[PDB]
Design a protein around this ligand. Structure first.
Ligand SMILES: [Ca+2]
Ligand SMILES: [Ca+2]
Ligand SMILES: [Ca+2]
Ligand SMILES: [Ca+2]
Ligand SMILES: [Ca+2]
Lengths: 23, 317, 316, 53, 53, 23, 53
């Protein structure tokens, strides 16, 4: 009620970082 | 047919290369202003040989349709730091004045296009476009910046870097680079002169000031020079057309900032001396600040020492 | 955003090529001087004309509707018919021809040829080939038919005249040539141009000495070496010595392109050590300077000091 | 490149150049690669490093 | 716990390790405008040191 | 047109190499 | 380059595993056992060349 939307949102997305791909 | 006499939008695309970053260690990191490491506008005519700066001395206006600043690491994942970047669309909203470090970072995750990332991965910081039809001018920033610059890229450091053994590194370190893929649209054909081309340098020398004299005998006062451009790289040399009786010694030293090459002196007894040269870049407001060391005995000076400034007109400089 | 796409980007503009001077009776002998300007028409063949800086950021060009103007700078009281043709085999060289008749006759047979008196103006066009061939960009490395859609020749049919109809003999500047282009580029990149330093830095450490003679008054040709082949420089005087005699020197340079400056010396109860000269260096590592030598201290007191300051830029 | 000697002319409809690494992520160097199509204007003549990149 | 490195020994020096966000929701009630605290400390001279030359 | 198939193909398949499985 | 032309070649880091297969001619040929006496095309059905990059 009486609420402006999307004032100051944030979105986070993780990933990884392996030691070798070894294609 | 030819000789059109018409103005037309020309949309273009490309990728470029900004400057490498330089992360600060421990012996160069004690204030809020050390956390901030690159203050770099995001206009068009603000580089050297990028295909966007050289390509913008040939139109007059521009507008970033969509831009993005891309980070690429040059480090292993075993190193640990963390840094954020944001593009402020009000180039005279300056974070130069915040003192507490936490406030400096909270006003970065408020702008509507900010990111956060480790210095061992990659991410695109986008530019955000005002809701108007405004067209910004190219060229050097002359009087006010809100005509020319459409943004300012502030990258700033949160943590302190460190090796695998936890020992915080003491010196600087290169942590990758920034590339700026872009799409912009130019309007008016012309040539701005401020990025002149090589084989046209002239070495102007027509500005002759004079150092203010002291009032007492021994003193180490200071002096500032106004009227210079907001940013350049000048050099000074002495200039002397006066007389003396006893000693009239003096020793000016470089300004109090990074750039410094040597010293300069004045001494007017039989073992006369007049030599020296200092190099520097004027501050963003367009002046400089020297410091003097005078050690003569005469008080009725009435002969302010003269000096000289000279510069090479080769580019924006 | 990244696209990895290639497009054409048709552009438009107008430019300034050069000025033009017509030969008089004395300088006119045969076909080699009959021609007076042999100037290629490519995109990267100018000194900063918005296409020699703008055809640095693409590899390939192809004109569409180029055209060359002639704008005079003379009255109607002079006349010398001249013609102009843009040839498209750039290896065709009219200097081989020796008879002036055939020289004037392989010139107007070209399609985009125009013939006019040099008291009025005229537009010479560029006739574009039929196929889809795109010409590279850069300087002319080794071969030319990749990098020139055309050259531009401007000839001089029978000699000048005067109000009373006589041929004058002195050389004369007549007008200037302009250009109005529309071209289509492709393949964004940068062609290189040799550049060894890309940011300012001053070489404020070099030092030398000027020898005065043991003579009361004589002018010399004191020379300097250890410099670059061709560059710009500027001298500043200074002195870290002593003397108690009436010395005086007001030396001056000996150059033609850049001799704007002066130097002075004076060493007594009043002092004068002001001045600057800036010059070009011929391709030897050499520069000539002349002294004044109006001092009374015949005995050699001590030679003075000077210093160059080389600006480390793209190339000096 | 032996089988192309049996035809005068060619044209690459497509091409691409993979990079198949050999190291772990504990060694770091940005390296940058491209394909220039004017095979005469070369980078060897540049004498600085900031313009070469 | 104390710090530990790759090899199981204690680190000697402090450091920074991360950051902290705050994903919130909130509800305000009464429209108004609170003041801003303006404060200033008066002057105070300090002459309590005898000198020597 | 006039195109022999599968002259000299190559196929690549990536993988990873973590630091521990911790079954 | 003459190794990534044979029809059963592989490439891999020396920290992982992979199977190099043998490829079979389109005939009914039977090769002899034993030491290689005079000519090798009777006895050996292949030759495993491993080589370092
Ligand atoms: Ca702001
Ligand atoms: Ca021809
Ligand atoms: Ca021909
Ligand atoms: Ca190229
Ligand atoms: Ca090229």
């Amino acid at each position: 009620p009486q609420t402006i939307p999307n004032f100051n949102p944030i979105v986070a997305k993780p990933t990884v970082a392996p030691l070798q791909t070894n294609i | 047919s030819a000789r059109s006499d018409v103005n037309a939008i020309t949309v273009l695309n490309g990728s470029d290369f900004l400057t490498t970053v330089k992360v600060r260690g421990s012996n160069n990191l004690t204030d809020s202003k050390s956390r901030i490491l690159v203050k770099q506008p995001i206009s068009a005519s603000s580089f050297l040989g990028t295909r966007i700066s050289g390509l913008s001395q040939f139109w007059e206006r521009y507008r970033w349709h969509k831009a993005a600043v891309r980070y690429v690491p040059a480090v292993p994942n075993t190193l640990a730091c963390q840094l954020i970047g944001y593009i402020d669309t009000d180039p005279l909203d300056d974070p130069n004045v915040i003192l507490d470090v936490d406030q400096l970072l909270r006003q970065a995750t408020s702008q509507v296009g900010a990111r956060q990332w480790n210095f061992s991965d990659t991410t695109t910081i986008p530019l955000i476009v005002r809701r108007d039809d405004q067209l910004y001018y190219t060229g050097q920033d002359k009087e006010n910046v809100r005509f020319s610059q459409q943004g300012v890229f502030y990258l700033l450091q949160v943590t302190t870097l460190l090796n695998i053994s936890g020992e915080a590194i003491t010196n600087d370190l290169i942590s990758g680079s920034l590339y700026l893929d872009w799409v912009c649209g130019f309007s008016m054909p012309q040539i701005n002169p401020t990025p002149v081309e090589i084989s046209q340098l002239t070495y102007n020398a027509d500005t002759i000031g004079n150092w203010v004299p002291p009032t007492e005998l021994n003193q180490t006062y200071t002096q500032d020079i106004t009227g210079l451009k907001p940013n350049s790289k000048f050099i000074i040399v002495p200039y002397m057309d006066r007389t003396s009786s006893e000693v009239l010694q003096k020793c000016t030293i470089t300004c109090n900032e990074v750039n410094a090459v040597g010293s300069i002196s004045y001494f007017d007894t039989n073992d006369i001396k007049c030599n020296g040269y200092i190099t520097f870049q004027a501050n963003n407001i367009g002046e400089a600040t020297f410091t003097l060391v005078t050690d003569y005995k005469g008080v009725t000076d009435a002969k302010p020492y003269q000096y000289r400034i000279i510069r090479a007109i080769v580019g924006n400089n």
